[model samples]
Target: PWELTILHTNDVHSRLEQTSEDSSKCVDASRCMGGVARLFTKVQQIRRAEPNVLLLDAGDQYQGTIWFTVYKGAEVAHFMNALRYDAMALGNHEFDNGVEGLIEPLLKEAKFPILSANISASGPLASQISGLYLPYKVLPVGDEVVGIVGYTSKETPFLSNPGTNLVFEDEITALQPEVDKLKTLNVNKIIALGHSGFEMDKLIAQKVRGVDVVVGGHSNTFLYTGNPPSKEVPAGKYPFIVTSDDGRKVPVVQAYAFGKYLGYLKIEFDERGNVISSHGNPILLDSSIPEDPSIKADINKWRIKLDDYSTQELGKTIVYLDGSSQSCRFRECNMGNLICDAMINNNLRHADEMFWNHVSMCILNGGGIRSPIDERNDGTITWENLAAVLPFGGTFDLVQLKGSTLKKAFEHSVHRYGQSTGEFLQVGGIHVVYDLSRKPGDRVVKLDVLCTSCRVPSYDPLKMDEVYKVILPNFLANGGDGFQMIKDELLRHDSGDQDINVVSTYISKMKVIYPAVEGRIKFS
Candidate 1:
């Protein structure tokens, strides 16, 4: 009736293993910062210490590394089972492979309750796995009954692979009725577990009636109270308190993604189930945390399946694939150069030898890249690292469009300025200058695309009506990341090559690749 310790992780994103020191790579086991094994050990310790602990995951347990790429959702369910998560919200990535993708691995296999208050299973999918999921669940934490209402983002339909079948309703509009329904069942302590970003979390806190806490995901917001807001960093306090419309304290919490930190919130509730007070912080799964031996061994068992992947030396990189969120999203990164360049030529070493033609340009979205190819020691890019970097399994596709259409896409790419936006365009065979100070459509100070297919490659202005061929991932081809122009084009083909294959195949044949920064994208 008084206390409940909620242990939560948001946006784990299939980080089943330890991440390297920089949190960019995940190959090394011993020296790395986090692993599900370590998280597993710590969770058990916390739960053992306090019997009234509620273990929760705030969505995004899919699509980060080869783990999700190879075994798909099965890997997520396997570890989630081992960790014994009490309840988990559905993240947008869960539907990345479509509803059928998550249904088999998650709905059919998951032992725990999967909650989503806003999603409608009205489609044919209802017959396959409806009973396994729920909108809200009531659990007995100690003597007090607590109601947990969870929901995935309504934006799932736009940004992710959740098709037309899975309909996502509004958060507050859908949730208020559920909360009201729960109150009928005499449940007053309701915690809103959802995958909408930070702004929406606050909106939920302000707009919702009976919610005591909002455990959020999707933004990977790092909110810490004691650690002062670097004066400029957006991450708020650990338990970001919001005064509800009814004058109640609503604490919102989220752990940063990729198993880097685990959020610990201890809440005191009155006899009425309203939160009296709450305080806590996210625990950094650091070097000191000893990973459970059994869990580590089990992970090693999973590693056996990925041996060929982890050990196969695709090639060596003299330069780092600057795939960090900071580099790729905001600026022209070498990783972007390497990838887009790979997509253009496809077989770099064999291109000239095999007499291969090239596209006018390849514009790969910065968002599709998942992780960086770590460059500390040897800089040897193994297959595992490659797959982790581009794990979406999107095939490389080609499309022909009017030259003027290419410029329109570029303008859309630079729409997000003064912020790290995944929509930023990372290009190959193009020279462009951008002035963020100017309005978006006019931000392109200069744009010149090169035709590698020409007898003598030369930069040429984008002739409005001239047809030009382009190369990009199928995700972009299908209008993922607001790139509908690519999907809109009539002549588009699956190049018979996947995105990962282009880079890996190029690297494999080249033996030594030295991708460097070019003045392709200049900011005014």
Candidate 2:
């Protein structure tokens, strides 16, 4: 039998430092959880003890936090190279800064291979980044020649800014051929290292014939084995097993994002390359782990430039901004309400030429809002706070749609309720009652859309054909979050200010903004 140990992490979205123990924010690295320095120390310790270990990262080494906003791909490349990863899949956030952000810097400077079997660049993108990536890679692990296959999410364009020129094929289709090619070369042990979300990863594991394990990312799914692995709730069991159609068992694993955990999987293979068994746990990256002294020093040097902005107070809040996906994506959050209300209030005074004269209700996708604003704190919001909450920098815009289309969008938003997703809609003018027990496309069983311009504002059941002016991000107006109906008949789509700035201004205007759950969204 042949044995191999795989060390992996996914969606480590540029968390150069650890998450703060206070308020669930990203500040005070010394008191936080999961820093790259600690990740490096743990990885190095494992390599020294295990001669047959394979180190891998499931992509998203970019975006999120000031470190990425300031350094972009350079910081990612330097640290990733320090970790000495065997291979890395391209996460969606890697393209957040657009193709040039990755081409000239990320793909060019990295010492390790950046892979995407499902993604291809054509036209201008191809001209710049064509030959820098490979669909699959073969490497030596002790006496075994292990084949590693890569697959970035096919949903890149809808989720982030991959542009029209980049073409993404389905994950299963892209993966099978590569797995087959590896088998042709007498490589029996195959690992599907991909940045596809958890659902897609399992589908690939079940459908792709030769893949033995799927190291996944993009969903930030926390999988653990045995006793509770961390303080956070896990999405599923670690090394989740799925029975393939052919009766063989396939193991799939993913660590939750932001460098909080390292997934370790040990697989045993028959001499013929067939898997004999699999097992492992995700290592929680707490203060208990040693932080690599060199890596910590490098991070300290970078934080010098971030100090000024981190201390700049944006505003104060009496209510907590619940930006956690578990809260915002699954239900109405104070931050969601704050941002949605801020969008309407900020755009309320703009000229009718810019938007419909009476735009009242605005919808911010729970997915668009990131980071928690903490339940209790000094109440002063900082640039770091706003940036973390609305990091994309995409401005708020208008999208006019028929009442029917609006309801359809709401149905889609609550479709994935109970689980964290990008589809949840937080409101500015409407209050919705969703029935989670109902299936998708029918979750918004009741609605109360408010009319703010009326002498005495009121709300009523929505009319199917009534045209309503709504506010949203420019990203969603152009077919993001699977809201195509809004994209189809946009009466007014306008943008001039960045979302973070808009929310900042909204907070600045209010001396003491007190946003509450207020039942803007109700669950039955």
Candidate 3:
């Protein structure tokens, strides 16, 4: 029998350092878990036992913390190189820096293959790949020939850079034929490296055939073997079916996000080339384990650089930001209101430059504000405090759109309001009155665009060709909220300047902009 071991991780949103000192929920209570240093240690220990083991990350490698904000993913590329990752799938955040941001580091520094099946490299990712990425690669382990195929999610068009020609197709639809081709090569085992979430992986297993093991990313799920002693999967759980591909059972596994857990899967195939069984589990990475010396040294070197980059205070806060509290869930909390209001004020100041007496409005996608600004008991704010509030590094932009396009954008926002993955806009520069009782696309019976100076209604939608200066994040401008109408409008007008780093610039100027809910948007 031939044994194969695989390790994987997904959605590591640049949590290179330990969790914040006050973040007891993640570190102290969660047991001081999941830094790259600890993850490196775990990988080395595992590889020592199983030298043929493969290490992989699922994606979301960029645009999370101050480190990515400063280095533009260069540091991450270096870290991955040190870890000697075999391959990785590109998550949506990989495009957060835009096409121009990926060129130098990915082209010159990367040592592993960034495997993606759905994304065509015609846009920004093209300059880096230069026709080098293959859909699948075949590797030899002992006498067994294992084939690995990679795919990214199809949601890239809605979540990434506008005007990017890259397109992602349905995974099972596009990959089944490729799997057939791989099987014809008489490979012993077929492994899938996918950025699609776990649920999607289950569906893929049910639909596609000829796949032996499916390693999933994007949606963070920790599945591993053993208990306290062995820490491996309970025995006899071999060939855990992750998906039902071609009537054959496929085991699926993924490490949770942020390097907190290392996922391990072992598959033993009989001499007749049938998977006899499989077992796996997720191991928590902690300080109790010995650090990988090489990776520790590399991280230490990077830590010095990270400290220098993150040292400059972007802004000061009068109130402490608290994103961990439960009040933030299910409704518009004070912290949410503050962040959105700050975004609005920041954009309005910038918009005053070009549009004279223009009706400027800012809409903040609630999903963009990943954390909340909590007022601590003492009311003192640290740099780490501000970072806790807004961790996602969201950038703002100004766009011109007609009334019709505006209506379409609102419809898109409303549609996504209830879904977990969808976003709801926290608006400013207008007092919006909507009837949630009505269906989508017609929910906003009255949208009153308030003039900053006059406090009066500006252009009405009834009058056609009236352009409004709308301030929004680049993601929304690119139609992130399923605003196909906005995409259409972008196709028509297409000419606009994107103020990159607008959020950073705004934060720099304001120092600290606290928010209050003043009824900019209302519902009956």
Lowest summed lDDT across 10 adjacent residues in model 3 is found at 491-500
Per-residue alpha-carbon lDDT of candidate 3 for residues 198-276, written as tens digits (9 for 90 to 100): 7777777677787777788765555544343223233223234753634666787777566666778888877655677
Candidate 1: the clashing residue pairs are 18-34, 224-238, 225-238
lDDT per residue, candidate 1, 1-524, as tens digits?
A: 48899999987866788877545455566667667999998899898898688889888887656677567789888888999988999887787677889888887888788899899876567776576778999988777788999888886753455656677999999999999999999998899998888878899988889999999988768888675322224377879999999998899998877788888999988888878889998887876899899999999899787676766778898777788878888888898989887876652211233233545578888887778887765868887787778876455666677777777788888886757777888898788889889987888878888865556678877777877767777677768788777668635333224466568768887888888888888898
Q: List the candidates' TM-scores in order.
A: 0.67, 0.67, 0.64
Candidates arranged by lDDT, highest first: 2, 1, 3
lDDT of candidates 1 onward, in order:
0.79, 0.79, 0.62
RMSD of each: 11.3, 10.8, 10.6
Cα distance off (Å), candidate 3, residue 368 = 13
lDDT by residue for model 2 (320-380), tens:
7778888888878988998888887755432223333366788989899889886466888
Q: For every model in order, what is the number of clashing pairs?
A: 3, 0, 23
Query: What value does the lDDT take at residue 197 in candidate 2?
Result: 80
The window of 10 residues in a row where model 1 has the poorest summed lDDT is 347-356
